[PDB]
């Protein structure tokens, strides 16, 4: 049920998504070990993910949360990087996409910093890097990230290093 629609670089929507991607790069405490050494990206393509069933699944849950939280879904736009990007865009997020060993328990993790999500594109800790060169800092191979609509509702605040 999923179709992918290419955005033109001239589209204000392409431009605002690219700006969120580029502007939320930071340096990481691993010196680039997991995600590579970089300060910015070369954006090759931005596609809108269209799936009516998955969208209706999201908005149904969003209304449930909102009704439990004084009509406030606390919806954010956040990054997600995963080796399972292809399954996610076709079948939706579920338990198979969870970070079982994550520091806040087994759930599905999202980042404000696109560069944090970039650390997970090739797996936890960057895995063994790109499939072709086995390089976590590969400047050749094409990577994919998701920019996702996320319902937080009432969120438990964890202070952490």
């Amino acid at each position: 049920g999923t179709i992918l629609i290419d955005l033109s670089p001239d589209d204000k929507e392409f431009q605002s998504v690219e700006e969120e991607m580029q502007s939320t790069v930071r340096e990481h405490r691993d010196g680039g070990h997991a995600g590579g050494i970089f300060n910015r990206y070369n954006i090759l393509k931005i596609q809108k993910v269209c799936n009516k069933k998955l969208w209706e699944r999201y908005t149904h849950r969003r209304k449930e949360v909102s009704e439990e939280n004084h009509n406030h879904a606390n919806e954010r736009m956040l990054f997600h990087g995963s080796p399972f990007v292809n399954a996610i865009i076709h079948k939706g997020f579920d338990e198979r996409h969870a970070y079982i060993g994550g520091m806040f328990g087994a759930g599905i993790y999202f980042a404000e910093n696109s560069s944090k999500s970039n650390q997970y594109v090739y797996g936890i800790g960057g895995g063994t890097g790109c499939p072709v060169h086995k390089d976590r800092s590969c400047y050749i191979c094409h990577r994919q990230l998701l920019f996702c609509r996320v319902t937080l509702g009432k969120s438990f605040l964890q202070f952490s290093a």
């Binding site: 930071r26 050494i37 520091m103 328990g105």
Partner: protein, 47 residues
């Protein structure tokens, strides 16, 4: 998949040491996220 803390729908991981890090978030239901945009990109080597 774990459960959200009782009375909550998600967890926010607030950075407490690295002053430049932004927040990270966890949901425990797949239905609480929709993958709106697929971004294809390369990282760029600093000059």
């Amino acid at each position: 998949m774990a459960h959200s803390p009782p009375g909550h729908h998600s967890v926010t991981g607030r950075p407490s040491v690295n002053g430049l890090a932004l927040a990270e978030y966890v949901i425990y239901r797949g239905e609480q996220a929709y993958p709106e945009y697929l971004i294809t990109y390369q990282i760029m080597r600093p000059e």
